[PDB]
Design a protein around this ligand. Sequence first.
Ligand code: HEC
Ligand code: HEC
Ligand SMILES: [Cl-]
Ligand SMILES: [Cl-]
Length: 413
Amino acid sequence: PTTVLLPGAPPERVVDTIGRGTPQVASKVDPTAAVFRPDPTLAALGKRVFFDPALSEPRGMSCASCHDPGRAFAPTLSPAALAGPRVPQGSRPGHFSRRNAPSLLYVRYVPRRHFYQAPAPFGGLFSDGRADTLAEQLRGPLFDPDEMNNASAAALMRKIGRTGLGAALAGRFGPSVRRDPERMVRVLGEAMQAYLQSDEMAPFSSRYDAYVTKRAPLTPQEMRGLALFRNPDKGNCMSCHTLSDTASRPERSLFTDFGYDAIAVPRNRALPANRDPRHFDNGLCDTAAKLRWPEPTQWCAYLRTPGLRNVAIKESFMHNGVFDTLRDAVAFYNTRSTDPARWYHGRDTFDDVPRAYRGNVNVNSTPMNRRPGTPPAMTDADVDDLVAFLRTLTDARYVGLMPTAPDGKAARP
Ligand code: HEC
Ligand code: HEC
Ligand SMILES: [Cl-]
Ligand SMILES: [Cl-]
């Protein structure tokens, strides 16, 4: 028995099934083994969908409204979003996403959900892995009242069917796209998958990529940061945000293994759902329960480790948008454990994890494993050097959006 976890990759041997059909596999998914066969006409249809502002209610919001091509397909936040929750605003005033949105560059390397050995979960789209594929993912934004707010697949089908996009989809997929709501959603997903898997959506054009391939050097400070990033006794970042500068092949450096961990970033008290003090976004365990994985609450507070390419142009950081500077996101790792009150709004422990799940939080990975009264693993100069290294991961098109002072905030329109 085998399963294919990335497009065109070799089938992987399945050793077991977890819950409703999540495969456990015998070997690590290798991103270099995927094969993305170009499909220019289907990818162009996906791009047409991506930029179509008729696909929201009220009209005016496209996928690009939260995934700006000018910012590595990460959000350029609206004024209300900047002034309030620091996550994307949806199609209406006063409605916002429940989480921050990531860059969609390199998203084609997010594998299907799987376990690999205890065995650990990997893959799935969204930060809680609740969509198995890009085709399934777009059901989220299309029908979420806090995002694009289409009322139903039936309503969206009727709307699209009256437009040129409807004609283009019917031309390619047949006339029933206008009469079968679930077929319409499925073929929107097929088109989108082709666009998001196209080569232009994985450019590998950063200065780090030039250092890996063309041997174009980084600065001494950037090299210090790279060494801290891979130092298990200081940054230890590479243990989750994995990289390999080998074979001059940039795709071995995606800065994530697509696994899950629980680092317990501070509560974003400006997020609407957090007005309820009993509400916590618990991440992966909600997906685990839907998939009937065993003992799903062991995964509460776990979130998918994000890749760090183009991180330095984002306007807010982490799944809840809680940090507004890259340096704060890095500094959090250094003193979360030694100085919890600085990070958790005065509390001595995590303020965005229910008491019931505080034991799920990682307190043994360096640098988050030092009790108060112990010196932190790194100095402030070390943190500065790590930021300098992360800034080398910006694709060439976008370097002007990084703050010119590295401790600052990304450029805003
Ligand atoms: C702002 C209101 C959004 C709009 C409009 C769209 N997306 Fe988005 N997207 C948004 C958020 C807040 C998130 C993360 C949510 C989570 O629970 O983690 C996403 C995520 C995606 C992803 C997954 C990326 C990954 O897991 O690495 C993809 C593939 C994606 N978004 C695509 C997508 C498309 C195709 C959209 C138009 C139909 C679309 N998004 C709109 C917020 C918003
Ligand atoms: C596994 C235990 C991790 C270690 C060690 C490090 N990171 Fe991490 N990182 C991890 C997760 C699960 C998350 C998401 C948490 C959430 O609440 O969303 C992150 C996130 C980041 C970010 C934000 C990226 C963004 O797109 O918002 C950055 C900037 C980042 N991590 C940096 C980073 C550095 C420099 C590390 C060594 C000091 C490091 N991380 C370690 C998981 C893990
Ligand atoms: Cl109908
Ligand atoms: Cl806050």
